[PDB]
Amino acid sequence: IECLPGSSPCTDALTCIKADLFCDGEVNCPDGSDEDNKMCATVCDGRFLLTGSSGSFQATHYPKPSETSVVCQWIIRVNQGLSIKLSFDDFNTYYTDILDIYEGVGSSKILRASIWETNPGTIRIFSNQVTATFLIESDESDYVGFNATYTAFNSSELNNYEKINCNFEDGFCFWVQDLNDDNEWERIQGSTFSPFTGPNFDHTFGNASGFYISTPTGPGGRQERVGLLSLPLDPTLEPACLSFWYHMYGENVHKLSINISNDQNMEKTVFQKEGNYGDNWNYGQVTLNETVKFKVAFNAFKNKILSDIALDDISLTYGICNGSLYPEPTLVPTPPPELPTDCGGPFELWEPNTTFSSTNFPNSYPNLAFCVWILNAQKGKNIQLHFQEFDLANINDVVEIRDGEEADSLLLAVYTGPGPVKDVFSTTNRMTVLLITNDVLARGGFKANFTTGYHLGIPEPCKADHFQCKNGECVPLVNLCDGHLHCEDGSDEADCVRFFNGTTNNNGLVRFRIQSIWHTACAENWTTQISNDVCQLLGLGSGNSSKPIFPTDGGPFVKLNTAPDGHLILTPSQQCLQDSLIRLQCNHKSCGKKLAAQDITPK
Amino acid sequence: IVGGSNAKEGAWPWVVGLYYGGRLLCGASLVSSDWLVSAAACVYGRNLEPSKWTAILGLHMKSNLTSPQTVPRLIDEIVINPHYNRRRKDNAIAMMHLEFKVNYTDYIQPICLPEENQVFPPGRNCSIAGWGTVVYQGTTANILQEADVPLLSNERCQQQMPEYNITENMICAGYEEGGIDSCQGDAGGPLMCQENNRWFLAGVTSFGYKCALPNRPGVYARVSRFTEWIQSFLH
Amino acid sequence: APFDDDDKIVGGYNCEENSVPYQVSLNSGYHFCGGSLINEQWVVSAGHCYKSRIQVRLGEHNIEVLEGNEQFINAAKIIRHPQYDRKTLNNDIMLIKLSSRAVINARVSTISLPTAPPATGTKCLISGWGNTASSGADYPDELQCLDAPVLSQAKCEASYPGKITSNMFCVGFLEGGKDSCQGDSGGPVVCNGQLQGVVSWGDGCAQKNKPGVYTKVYNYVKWIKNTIAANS
Ligand SMILES: *[C@@H]1O[C@H](CO)[C@@H](O[C@@H]2O[C@H](CO)[C@@H](O[C@@H]3O[C@H](CO)[C@@H](O)[C@H](O[C@H]4O[C@H](CO)[C@@H](O)[C@H](O)[C@@H]4O)[C@@H]3O)[C@H](O)[C@H]2NC(C)=O)[C@H](O)[C@H]1NC(C)=O
Ligand SMILES: *[C@@H]1O[C@H](CO)[C@@H](O[C@@H]2O[C@H](CO)[C@@H](O[C@@H]3O[C@H](CO)[C@@H](O)[C@H](O[C@H]4O[C@H](CO)[C@@H](O)[C@H](O)[C@@H]4O)[C@@H]3O)[C@H](O)[C@H]2NC(C)=O)[C@H](O)[C@H]1NC(C)=O
Ligand SMILES: *[C@@H]1O[C@H](CO)[C@@H](O[C@@H]2O[C@H](CO)[C@@H](O[C@@H]3O[C@H](CO[C@H]4O[C@H](CO)[C@@H](O)[C@H](O)[C@@H]4O)[C@@H](O)[C@H](O)[C@@H]3O)[C@H](O)[C@H]2NC(C)=O)[C@H](O)[C@H]1NC(C)=O
Ligand SMILES: *[C@@H]1O[C@H](CO)[C@@H](O[C@@H]2O[C@H](CO)[C@@H](O[C@@H]3O[C@H](CO[C@H]4O[C@H](CO)[C@@H](O)[C@H](O)[C@@H]4O)[C@@H](O)[C@H](O)[C@@H]3O)[C@H](O)[C@H]2NC(C)=O)[C@H](O)[C@H]1NC(C)=O
Ligand SMILES: *[C@@H]1O[C@H](CO[C@@H]2O[C@H](CO)[C@@H](O[C@@H]3O[C@H](CO)[C@@H](O)[C@H](O[C@H]4O[C@H](CO)[C@@H](O)[C@H](O)[C@@H]4O)[C@@H]3O)[C@H](O)[C@H]2NC(C)=O)[C@@H](O)[C@H](O)[C@H]1NC(C)=O
Ligand SMILES: *[C@@H]1O[C@H](CO)[C@@H](O[C@@H]2O[C@H](CO)[C@@H](O[C@@H]3O[C@H](CO)[C@@H](O)[C@H](O)[C@@H]3O)[C@H](O)[C@H]2NC(C)=O)[C@H](O)[C@H]1NC(C)=O
Ligand SMILES: *[C@@H]1O[C@H](CO)[C@@H](O[C@@H]2O[C@H](CO)[C@@H](O[C@@H]3O[C@H](CO)[C@@H](O)[C@H](O)[C@@H]3O)[C@H](O)[C@H]2NC(C)=O)[C@H](O)[C@H]1NC(C)=O
Ligand SMILES: *[C@@H]1O[C@H](CO[C@@H]2O[C@H](CO)[C@@H](O[C@@H]3O[C@H](CO)[C@@H](O)[C@H](O)[C@@H]3O)[C@H](O)[C@H]2NC(C)=O)[C@@H](O)[C@H](O)[C@H]1NC(C)=O
Ligand SMILES: *[C@@H]1O[C@H](CO)[C@@H](O[C@@H]2O[C@H](CO)[C@@H](O)[C@H](O)[C@H]2NC(C)=O)[C@H](O)[C@H]1NC(C)=O
Ligand SMILES: *[C@@H]1O[C@H](CO)[C@@H](O[C@@H]2O[C@H](CO)[C@@H](O)[C@H](O)[C@H]2NC(C)=O)[C@H](O)[C@H]1NC(C)=O
Ligand SMILES: *[C@@H]1O[C@H](CO)[C@@H](O)[C@H](O)[C@H]1NC(C)=O
Ligand SMILES: *[C@@H]1O[C@H](CO)[C@@H](O)[C@H](O)[C@H]1NC(C)=O
Ligand SMILES: *[C@@H]1O[C@H](CO)[C@@H](O)[C@H](O)[C@H]1NC(C)=O
Ligand SMILES: *[C@@H]1O[C@H](CO)[C@@H](O)[C@H](O)[C@H]1NC(C)=O
């Protein structure tokens, strides 16, 4: 006799069932051996079934620290109609005491109870069988154990007062969590996690030593529904008033409502609150009078993280509700959404006015800034933007400098982020300064002198008739379009060869400028090598066939000759036999052609 | 995004990728031996410190940067066209300077700039390159995506998208029924239209209303009017 | 409809832990926290993430789509600092022992233990399942990772109304988005190749002014070493 993996045989060895169905409170073996105490080695106490009206059970290694990880679970069953009331004495342990209590057996074991790091207290379950499971969080010697007792009583003799009156000092008292929602409540002692939401103290006791219930503090990012149900209430000749305290702290609190369901299915809402009321316990008071049995359901809608809702001090009295000593709760005011567009401020920044000051530079500038400064100067002047202190966030807010004087602006540079920034020099007399910022986490800002004059930022022109590159260096004779290198920018080698009297972008007569004089070239010793040399000087591709037309240039044409060092020889001498100007044509460079090894599949 | 297709290796050597902080943020096109052409919207505020931009030329697979055909490079100088305004959404063209130079190993080649007196009738299929996604809000594909869209005139673009002024300096493209677009997902890069012998830089991928939406053409930078500006950083 | 933006702006969000192999996720049926892979058999995360059952996911790229590079490891051991108060978030740090040795690859790797605490201005990488969009009313499936500098200790302490202890410091802001990316209640915060924060808490969902609070593990490196030695 063998069983499939993941399954265990019974005592009779007649069939194989899943191991998870053993010692769960539900009979699965044909002979009922799955519920036997001997088979279910509790180890913690040595007994598994507690069918009497009273008894006790103990955890593993109660008097001394334990060094063994053994899963323990207990099942307590009583006669139908009796409610089992649990009791605990010692649970002050540094976790490692995860206790799971579930109402009934089967699919009802989802989110009934999960208690650790606190005293469970008196817990009552309105079912014939109670499933208690003890799970060890770790095998480290940092836990002691516990021993608990139980008792049974008639659950239907309870009046409307006992079914509702509960300070949550010991669990839910006589309340049963809902099952039609996603996630249920849990027991929390003292302040909760996730600051700025959830209660920080218990209302009944007044400080952290108290016991209450609230929505789970798990840092989830999904919307969940939490509901609580009440026992049926017998009809009464006098209306009853419901007193309860509700805590609604959190920016994501959606809605807390109460639904009353009777045998007539006339569901109605008498209590409903929305929004955030701060860290204050708010008193609730409703009046209910039903001629038939009815139940009180607490409906809580939980949004993503920071949407905690708490309930405490629920009780039921008799007669019409009296004057509520605690007034209606006050909602936390929202930030004013009144015109967050922009502030405007100093629209114009010109004249001999002093340094810009927004009166809030040390602290912060208004969010969603779109203001402009408009730096203006006299005709013929420029604008210099020398920054004093610069401090911005990551790349979402920018500072724009524009020099177009109109809608056709000329963007110069963009500055953002912390650290010093370079000065900005404009080309015109009007500089447009734009500050575009986000709606969150404004920085200090920036300040500037905006002092300028005549031709500031432009390097002084070179003297002695020396050529000036982009860097302002002197190029008298050596690097005048002769394949040398003087300035770092490389502008000293600007193209001094261009087509003249041409027709297309690559067809035209040869025009050369050695130093400062434009002139053509002769055709005395022209060859293919000279053709490709001029192509390189013209920034084109391979040479193409060319045909002379007529010697129309009577000026000092330059004679081109080849040299062994690879440098073209330029002789500005009027020495040529049967001169004829060449209409040179050069092919285009290697453009975006698919010259790679590209092939297609012939299928 | 849906609409593109996987591109063969070496089919588009001029399409290169731009990385800022290790993430694929923008795409550029080679036009010379030391300069690139990319959209100016992706350099909006990241040019103050030209040291975090890494240009990957010849990139075809994001998760692979070790082939000899791919030569990683750093960008030390980024320039923005002064006519960029970010409000008129016009002249959104920028250029980046390579470290020292670039080679030509049959997988890193320069794009052909538009010439003078060039005619581009609408309706012709111009190829679009870029690393698109699988949905409107997906992630960039590990394989370069290629697609073809018909050219659209500036007259109909304003009617299709009244929210944008478009203006004659921008040329739109897209389908009447949509379904193929590259407005979202990445910067896109260059817009390419073929002419038998020389793949011309038909445009630079720019902003757009929304991808695959009918009557919502994608906006591209008109390089034909930017030829003189581009022809200022060539060896 | 232009929900996020009408231009090709993505905010520089990391492409599913690209070049960030020191991010792990904790699962208990849904994503609730995260941490940093300190070594091949241990992770570091904030102590407020304690749960009955925790599943550690290493190298997770998408919440729903699995790329085959994700390793699922159960929480064999869960140990928190003995001085961690349930009411006060001081010493907000916990260690979870992986039941199996981590697999080192291009998207899963360990992080070097810090030897000196940074003062200010140090670049930090914070990974968390935030909002990778400018606006909307949906939860994106992408994984958010934004760089962040280090603020001065005095400013971080003074910003909060006395809610900052000697083991807390401000690192990340994570502005923009629908309702910001928050701090994801955990996740790696590595500065200059050293894990400095584990994301403790913050004033709301990083609305403004005070975006979040991070726990400095430089004061708990000794405790981490002691726990590793005790549990091998
Ligand atoms: C646990 O205790 C509860 C105590 O409530 C018990 O439930 C029932 O309680 C009621 C009231 O205490 C008992 O009396 C009944 O009340 C109902 C109310 O509607 C009446 O309808 C019943 O009428 C019967 O008797 C009349 C003569 O007086 C007859 O004319 C009529 O036809 C009915 O036969 C009755 O007065 C009720 O007896 C108990 N239920 C039982 C079964 O005794 C509950 O039963 C207790 N739990 C267990 C497991 O015993
Ligand atoms: C607590 O009890 C209250 C009742 O006091 C209950 O309130 C319900 O609110 C909804 C509005 O949110 C009411 O309107 C319904 O809204 C749904 C939304 O989809 C509609 O589909 C419903 O229409 C149905 O019925 C129509 C015929 O009347 C059909 O033509 C239609 O196709 C739908 O089938 C409906 O208009 C609703 O009436 C009340 N009452 C209910 C649902 O009994 C609240 O939901 C309860 N809360 C809890 C937690 O139990
Ligand atoms: C809870 O208690 C409430 C009050 O105790 C209940 O309210 C009852 O609501 C019903 C309607 O469903 C009312 O019935 C109406 O009564 C009026 C009264 O008109 C007469 O008024 C005086 C009374 O002496 C008489 O002299 C006049 O000549 C009128 O004839 C009728 O006109 C209507 O037709 C209708 O019958 C009840 O009156 C009202 N109760 C009281 C005390 O007023 C409520 O139903 C209870 N339950 C719930 C769930 O709330
Ligand atoms: C640097 O620029 C600042 C602007 O950002 C200068 O502050 C003042 O800003 C206002 C804003 O509009 C300018 O506009 C003027 O406002 C005055 C207000 O005068 C009031 O009082 C007179 C009586 O003296 C009364 O007759 C008026 O009705 C007003 O009730 C107007 O009179 C002007 O017509 C004009 O609208 C100011 O020009 C500007 N300068 C001032 C008030 O001196 C700041 O002053 C500048 N810095 C320096 C050193 O001048
Ligand atoms: C937070 O607040 C708590 C609250 O202080 C404790 O309050 C409880 C009840 O509110 C006190 O319990 C009772 O106190 C009375 C008066 O001293 C005492 O007579 C009671 O004894 C009866 O019951 C016991 C069984 O419990 C029985 O054996 C006796 O014979 C008698 O019949 C009962 O103890 C409790 O005494 C208060 N605590 C103290 C020290 O007085 C504080 O305790 C916490 O310190 C506060 N702070 C924190 C951080 O928790
Ligand atoms: C582009 O790539 C090449 C190689 O990948 C870079 O180096 C250049 O390589 C060529 C080889 O074809 C060199 O030419 C040869 O150099 C050897 C050196 O001993 C010489 O003996 C040969 O006669 C021939 O000249 C070339 O010199 C070399 N470049 C330099 C500067 O030395 C090149 O740098 C890359 N970049 C470019 C071309 O911009
Ligand atoms: C340029 O691209 C456009 C768009 O891709 C091409 O036009 C249309 O392309 C679609 C393909 O999605 C064609 O649809 C197909 O049509 C055939 C019938 O011709 C049908 O049997 C298929 O099931 C499919 O629906 C569509 O016909 C085509 N329209 C036209 C007018 O050609 C266009 O062809 C491309 N240009 C060139 C030169 O290829
Ligand atoms: C706006 O400009 C402010 C100008 O800075 C001033 O520059 C002069 C230069 O002539 C400094 O004078 C010098 O003083 C030295 C002694 O400290 C002499 O040895 C030297 O020869 C020269 O005379 C002057 O000290 C300096 N500061 C002041 C306060 O005048 C600049 O200070 C602001 O920061 C700037 N604001 C911006 C950029 O936002
Ligand atoms: C020089 O240019 C001319 C065109 O101006 C070339 O002539 C044609 O070139 C094309 C290449 O695109 C060939 O397909 C044709 O067969 C050529 N001839 C004609 C009549 O069209 C010529 O080949 C070029 N010279 C060189 C050496 O490349
Ligand atoms: C948006 O486009 C309209 C239409 O071209 C522009 O309005 C014209 O602008 C030109 C040049 O600025 C003027 O010469 C015309 O007089 C304007 N009106 C018309 C009817 O053509 C407008 O300037 C553009 N920009 C906006 C509206 O901000
Ligand atoms: C648990 O055992 C201890 C013995 O140390 C005893 O004092 C206590 O009363 C027991 N608990 C219950 C509920 O009987
Ligand atoms: C309301 O006031 C009456 C006045 O005597 C009092 O008897 C009753 O206890 C109070 N509370 C109620 C009815 O809940
Ligand atoms: C170029 O053309 C003009 C007009 O056609 C003519 O006057 C001029 O002489 C030509 N240039 C040369 C060098 O012949
Ligand atoms: C990466 O893989 C691709 C797949 O074909 C290959 O072509 C390439 O050479 C590899 N290396 C790179 C891109 O560095």
Side-chain angles (χ1 to χ4, degrees):
Chain A
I1 300 180
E2 299 180 0
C3 290
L4 301 180
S7 60
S8 300
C10 301
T11 297
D12 54 356
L14 299 180
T15 181
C16 303
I17 58 176
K18 188 178 182 180
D20 298 4
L21 300 180
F22 286 89
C23 315
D24 198 70
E26 181 179 0
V27 179
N28 299 270
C29 287
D31 53 355
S33 59
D34 54 353
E35 301 293 334
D36 185 64
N37 297 267
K38 181 180 180 180
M39 179 179 299
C40 302
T42 58
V43 180
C44 278
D45 189 71
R47 299 179 300 180
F48 180 78
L49 292 182
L50 300 178
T51 59
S53 60
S54 60
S56 60
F57 63 97
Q58 302 179 0
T60 172
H61 301 70
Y62 185 82
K64 60 179 181 179
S66 179
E67 302 180 0
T68 309
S69 177
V70 177
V71 180
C72 296
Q73 182 181 2
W74 305 274
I75 295 296
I76 302 180
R77 178 185 177 182
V78 297
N79 300 330
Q80 184 180 0
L82 300 180
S83 180
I84 301 179
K85 176 169 60 180
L86 302 179
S87 180
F88 301 89
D89 60 335
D90 189 9
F91 256 82
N92 300 270
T93 314
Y94 195 44
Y95 49 89
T96 333
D97 59 337
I98 301 179
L99 179 61
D100 297 358
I101 300 180
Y102 300 105
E103 173 179 0
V105 297
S107 60
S108 62
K109 307 173 55 180
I110 300 298
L111 292 177
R112 181 55 60 185
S114 185
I115 308 178
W116 65 89
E117 276 278 358
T118 182
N119 302 114
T122 293
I123 304 179
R124 305 176 181 90
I125 292 89
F126 303 97
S127 180
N128 59 330
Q129 301 177 356
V130 177
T131 301
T133 304
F134 175 76
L135 301 179
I136 53 268
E137 188 259 10
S138 180
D139 203 8
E140 187 180 2
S141 301
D142 203 4
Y143 61 98
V144 180
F146 68 98
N147 50 340
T149 61
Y150 72 97
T151 178
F153 61 95
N154 174 289
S155 60
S156 179
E157 281 180 359
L158 314 172
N159 51 14
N160 299 332
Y161 175 81
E162 291 178 357
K163 295 178 180 180
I164 305 300
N165 180 85
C166 183
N167 300 120
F168 298 103
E169 177 184 0
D170 302 328
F172 287 74
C173 309
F174 301 87
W175 294 75
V176 179
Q177 299 81 1
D178 196 3
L179 298 179
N180 299 270
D181 295 331
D182 305 329
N183 146 84
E184 311 308 319
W185 307 83
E186 79 293 339
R187 311 96 182 99
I188 293 187
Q189 174 178 4
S191 65
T192 62
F193 302 94
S194 301
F196 294 85
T197 190
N200 295 269
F201 55 91
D202 178 72
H203 178 63
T204 301
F205 284 79
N207 69 334
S209 68
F211 213 75
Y212 61 90
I213 67 168
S214 60
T215 60
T217 56
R222 61 179 182 179
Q223 180 179 0
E224 298 176 352
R225 298 180 298 181
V226 193
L228 180 60
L229 298 181
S230 63
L231 301 179
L233 301 181
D234 301 330
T236 55
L237 301 179
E238 184 180 15
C241 187
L242 172 60
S243 300
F244 58 94
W245 295 79
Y246 56 98
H247 196 264
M248 302 170 62
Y249 196 11
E251 57 178 345
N252 300 330
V253 176
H254 179 59
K255 183 186 302 180
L256 179 63
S257 60
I258 299 180
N259 260 21
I260 306 303
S261 180
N262 49 14
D263 301 0
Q264 300 178 358
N265 301 330
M266 297 183 179
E267 300 180 0
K268 62 177 182 179
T269 300
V270 298
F271 170 79
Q272 181 179 0
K273 292 298 181 180
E274 300 178 8
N276 184 22
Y277 301 96
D279 188 11
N280 299 270
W281 289 91
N282 309 327
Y283 173 79
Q285 188 179 27
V286 295
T287 303
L288 302 176
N289 55 318
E290 299 291 338
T291 61
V292 299
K293 299 180 180 300
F294 66 100
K295 302 179 182 180
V296 182
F298 287 85
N299 301 120
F301 303 95
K302 180 181 180 181
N303 202 269
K304 64 179 181 180
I305 188 180
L306 309 177
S307 179
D308 295 333
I309 300 180
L311 302 177
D312 187 15
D313 193 8
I314 301 180
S315 60
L316 183 68
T317 181
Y318 311 93
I320 312 179
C321 301
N322 297 15
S324 179
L325 301 181
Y326 192 83
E328 299 293 337
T330 302
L331 279 172
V332 179
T334 58
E338 180 181 0
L339 299 180
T341 62
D342 56 77
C343 59
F347 187 87
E348 301 179 359
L349 268 74
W350 66 299
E351 293 180 358
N353 208 326
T354 179
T355 309
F356 160 77
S357 180
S358 61
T359 69
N360 52 22
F361 170 79
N363 299 330
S364 60
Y365 46 74
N367 286 323
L368 290 181
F370 294 99
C371 313
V372 72
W373 291 358
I374 305 291
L375 300 177
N376 300 330
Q378 300 180 0
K379 181 180 180 180
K381 299 181 180 180
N382 56 327
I383 302 294
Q384 178 179 0
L385 195 62
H386 190 4
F387 296 84
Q388 300 179 1
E389 181 180 0
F390 202 94
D391 196 333
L392 287 183
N394 49 15
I395 314 299
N396 298 270
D397 308 347
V398 299
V399 181
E400 301 182 9
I401 293 89
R402 304 184 175 278
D403 181 3
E405 310 184 39
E406 58 181 0
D408 189 8
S409 300
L410 300 180
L411 179 62
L412 297 184
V414 178
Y415 301 88
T416 175
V421 291
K422 299 180 180 180
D423 300 0
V424 196
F425 302 95
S426 67
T427 60
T428 301
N429 56 329
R430 298 181 179 180
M431 171 181 291
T432 296
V433 179
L434 290 173
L435 176 59
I436 298 181
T437 63
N438 52 11
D439 57 330
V440 51
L441 195 65
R443 291 304 301 181
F446 65 101
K447 301 175 59 180
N449 277 339
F450 52 87
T451 55
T452 331
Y454 293 92
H455 291 270
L456 292 189
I458 300 300
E460 180 180 0
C462 301
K463 301 180 180 60
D465 300 330
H466 293 172
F467 181 81
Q468 179 183 4
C469 61
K470 297 180 180 180
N471 197 23
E473 301 180 0
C474 301
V475 187
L477 296 178
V478 181
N479 323 268
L480 296 184
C481 198
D482 202 4
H484 299 283
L485 180 60
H486 181 75
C487 303
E488 301 179 0
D489 50 68
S491 57
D492 60 331
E493 293 294 333
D495 301 0
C496 60
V497 188
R498 59 174 298 182
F499 297 95
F500 198 63
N501 278 71
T503 57
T504 63
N505 300 330
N506 302 271
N507 196 337
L509 306 169
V510 283
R511 184 179 182 182
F512 295 88
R513 178 183 59 91
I514 300 178
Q515 299 182 359
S516 60
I517 301 181
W518 294 92
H519 49 275
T520 61
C522 63
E524 181 179 358
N525 199 20
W526 189 275
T527 181
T528 305
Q529 182 67 21
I530 303 181
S531 301
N532 46 245
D533 292 0
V534 180
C535 283
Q536 296 180 0
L537 294 180
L538 287 170
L540 299 181
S542 60
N544 193 274
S545 180
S546 306
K547 178 182 179 180
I549 301 300
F550 192 86
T552 56
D553 185 17
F557 52 89
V558 55
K559 181 180 180 180
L560 301 180
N561 299 272
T562 60
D565 58 358
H567 299 266
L568 182 62
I569 299 180
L570 284 74
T571 302
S573 182
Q574 303 179 5
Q575 297 179 0
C576 180
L577 180 60
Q578 300 181 0
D579 182 69
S580 297
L581 188 51
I582 297 183
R583 186 183 176 181
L584 182 62
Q585 303 178 179
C586 193
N587 299 327
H588 261 175
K589 302 179 299 180
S590 179
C591 256
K593 280 185 175 180
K594 296 182 178 180
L595 301 180
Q598 300 298 325
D599 200 335
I600 59 180
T601 302
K603 294 181 180 180
Chain B
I1 307 302
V2 178
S5 180
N6 297 330
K8 299 181 180 180
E9 300 180 359
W12 319 98
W14 46 88
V15 180
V16 313
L18 304 176
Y19 285 82
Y20 178 84
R23 198 269 180 183
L24 180 61
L25 181 60
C26 203
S29 60
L30 191 70
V31 292
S32 62
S33 60
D34 62 331
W35 281 86
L36 295 169
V37 169
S38 60
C42 71
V43 303
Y44 186 77
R46 300 181 181 90
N47 300 343
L48 180 56
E49 301 179 0
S51 60
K52 297 181 178 60
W53 286 91
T54 301
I56 306 301
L57 296 87
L59 185 66
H60 295 72
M61 289 179 284
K62 296 182 58 180
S63 60
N64 242 22
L65 227 174
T66 56
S67 185
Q69 65 182 5
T70 298
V71 181
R73 277 291 187 176
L74 301 180
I75 300 298
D76 300 330
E77 179 180 0
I78 308 179
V79 296
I80 301 183
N81 194 315
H83 299 262
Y84 198 15
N85 299 329
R86 196 52 187 269
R87 262 52 56 91
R88 301 265 57 172
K89 291 299 183 61
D90 194 4
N91 312 278
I93 172 178
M95 296 184 61
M96 292 183 175
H97 183 262
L98 296 182
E99 191 177 0
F100 300 104
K101 69 167 59 180
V102 85
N103 244 266
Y104 302 96
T105 170
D106 300 0
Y107 294 93
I108 302 179
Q109 300 186 11
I111 228 283
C112 223
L113 301 178
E115 302 179 7
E116 299 292 338
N117 300 330
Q118 291 293 337
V119 182
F120 305 96
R124 58 185 303 178
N125 293 15
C126 301
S127 300
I128 53 177
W131 293 268
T133 76
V134 300
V135 81
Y136 168 75
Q137 205 69 19
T139 60
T140 61
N142 302 330
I143 303 180
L144 180 61
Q145 302 293 336
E146 61 181 7
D148 301 331
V149 293
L151 192 62
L152 298 181
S153 60
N154 60 330
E155 301 181 0
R156 297 184 58 180
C157 188
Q158 299 180 0
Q159 300 180 0
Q160 294 177 263
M161 300 185 307
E163 304 181 1
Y164 306 144
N165 229 11
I166 302 308
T167 226
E168 299 181 0
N169 299 328
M170 306 295 292
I171 300 184
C172 312
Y175 291 90
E176 300 181 0
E177 299 181 0
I180 301 179
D181 203 333
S182 300
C183 290
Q184 287 76 24
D186 65 328
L191 164 62
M192 307 160 300
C193 225
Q194 247 279 0
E195 174 254 302
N196 181 359
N197 210 225
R198 256 73 160 79
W199 282 92
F200 291 87
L201 183 53
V204 180
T205 322
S206 181
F207 76 107
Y209 182 85
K210 190 170 181 300
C211 62
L213 260 58
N215 299 330
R216 295 299 181 270
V219 188
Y220 301 90
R222 183 174 183 176
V223 188
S224 67
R225 294 185 176 182
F226 299 153
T227 302
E228 299 181 0
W229 183 81
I230 296 183
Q231 291 181 358
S232 300
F233 308 99
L234 316 179
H235 285 274
Chain C
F3 291 98
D4 303 331
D5 202 338
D6 59 355
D7 200 332
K8 291 176 164 59
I9 299 300
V10 305
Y13 303 155
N14 190 278
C15 297
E16 298 177 350
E17 299 296 329
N18 196 332
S19 300
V20 189
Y22 46 83
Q23 182 269 350
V24 301
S25 300
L26 304 180
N27 180 269
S28 295
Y30 60 95
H31 165 60
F32 64 100
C33 283
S36 180
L37 191 68
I38 175 62
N39 56 78
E40 301 180 0
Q41 297 180 180
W42 294 85
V43 296
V44 184
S45 60
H48 65 169
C49 299
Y50 167 77
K51 294 295 299 180
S52 60
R53 295 299 181 269
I54 298 181
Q55 183 179 4
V56 184
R57 299 183 178 180
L58 290 80
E60 181 177 357
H61 298 72
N62 186 273
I63 174 64
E64 183 180 0
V65 181
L66 299 180
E67 301 292 338
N69 300 330
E70 301 81 7
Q71 181 179 3
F72 304 94
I73 302 180
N74 300 330
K77 294 183 179 180
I78 294 178
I79 295 184
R80 301 181 300 180
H81 289 244
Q83 300 180 0
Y84 171 79
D85 300 330
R86 301 301 301 269
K87 51 183 62 179
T88 302
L89 294 188
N90 185 23
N91 312 328
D92 190 7
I93 169 182
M94 63 180 295
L95 298 185
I96 298 180
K97 182 180 179 300
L98 301 181
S99 60
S100 300
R101 182 176 299 180
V103 180
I104 301 300
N105 57 83
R107 293 299 179 269
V108 179
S109 180
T110 67
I111 185 61
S112 180
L113 193 67
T115 59
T120 178
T122 301
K123 186 175 183 178
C124 308
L125 287 80
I126 305 179
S127 300
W129 293 81
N131 301 270
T132 62
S134 300
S135 60
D138 53 351
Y139 191 86
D141 60 331
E142 299 181 0
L143 185 36
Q144 182 62 266
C145 180
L146 296 178
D147 303 329
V150 175
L151 298 181
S152 58
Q153 182 71 17
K155 177 182 178 60
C156 185
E157 292 180 0
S159 300
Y160 296 79
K163 299 181 179 300
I164 300 300
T165 60
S166 60
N167 304 333
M168 302 179 181
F169 69 141
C170 303
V171 180
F173 310 99
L174 292 78
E175 325 88 357
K178 314 176 183 179
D179 197 4
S180 72
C181 301
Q182 305 179 2
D184 204 6
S185 300
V189 179
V190 169
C191 310
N192 196 20
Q194 299 179 359
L195 174 70
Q196 300 296 337
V198 295
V199 184
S200 183
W201 62 283
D203 296 8
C205 296
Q207 306 177 9
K208 59 181 180 180
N209 300 330
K210 282 76 61 180
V213 180
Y214 303 81
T215 301
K216 180 184 302 179
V217 306
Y218 179 80
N219 303 329
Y220 310 97
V221 288
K222 300 180 180 180
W223 191 93
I224 293 180
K225 289 183 176 180
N226 295 329
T227 303
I228 291 179
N231 300 326
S232 70

